[PDB]
Design a protein around this nucleic acid. Structure first.
Lengths: 123, 81
RNA sequence: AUUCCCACUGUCCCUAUCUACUAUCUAGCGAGGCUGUCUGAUCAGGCAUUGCGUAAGCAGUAGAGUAGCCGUUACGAUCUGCUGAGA
């Protein structure tokens, strides 16, 4: 080992930047944990709403009951059917995907409490 | 393991730094047997590094305790440059 | 909760001064400046438990800026002089 001035100056002159750095890290960790617990709360809420909607639908169900054609002039005509109502495809795809898916402390606790009270009442 | 008792003062951090230099873990405490009013603190150091070539200048008190560099102004009682 | 570092302090060395309140007797009975605010504005003052050294007025062509023309109305903080004055 060696004795170096830079390390001792870094250790002695600090004691304050390190504490605020630790506080910043703890604060940002707490913020991250809060955002997490919030998003899993969102997950629970969305699942509850989806489940009640599906149950409502289920219980209401029971209460219910390019061609090309060539001519003699070597001219070809291309005929393709068109779909103005796109809702048919959207409903068909929804039905298809639905089918696919389906610390250490020194003394005793009693002695520690007595000592703490005896220290507290003096002030 | 080196277990020692230090009177807390302005020269308490330098001893801790030196212990950290020579030991892998250095930690202080105050056992309940020691009275609260006393300024003594018991610091232990575990994991001696055991250098092959220790620096004699590291254990010399002449430079271990080297002083740190620096309207009714504050009373000038810190000497001169 | 405790211990050390710096800064401050009538806690102390070591007391001193002021204000308010109190206590006493008597007649009767009887166990210069500043903040806020107000006098319409200056000037001059009141209040806020002392709230916390150059007067008023006039003048200058000097004067941050407001307000008339493409040499020039007016208002004007601040500064200078009367002014070691005023009280």
């Amino acid at each position: 080992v060696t004795f170096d001035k830079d390390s001792r100056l870094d250790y002695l002159t600090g004691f304050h930047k390190r504490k605020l750095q630790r506080q910043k890290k703890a604060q940002e960790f707490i913020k991250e944990q809060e955002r997490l617990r919030k998003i899993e709360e969102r997950q629970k809420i969305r699942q509850e709403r989806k489940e009640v909607m599906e149950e409502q639908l289920k219980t209401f169900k029971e209460s219910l009951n390019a061609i090309t054609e060539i001519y003699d002039d070597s001219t070809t005509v291309e005929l393709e059917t068109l779909e103005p109502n796109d809702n048919f495809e959207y409903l068909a795809q929804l039905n298809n995907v639905k089918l696919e898916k389906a610390k250490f402390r020194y003394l005793t606790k009693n002695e520690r409490r007595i000592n703490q009270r005896k220290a507290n009442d003096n002030k | 393991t080196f277990v020692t008792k230090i009177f807390r003062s302005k020269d308490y951090n330098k001893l801790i730094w030196v212990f950290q230099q020579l030991f892998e873990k250095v930690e202080a405490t105050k056992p309940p047997a020691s009275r609260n009013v006393s300024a003594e603190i018991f610091v232990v150091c575990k994991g001696f590094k055991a250098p092959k070539r220790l620096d004699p200048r590291l254990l010399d008190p002449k430079e271990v305790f080297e002083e740190l560099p620096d309207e009714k102004k504050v009373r000038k009682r810190q000497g001169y440059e």
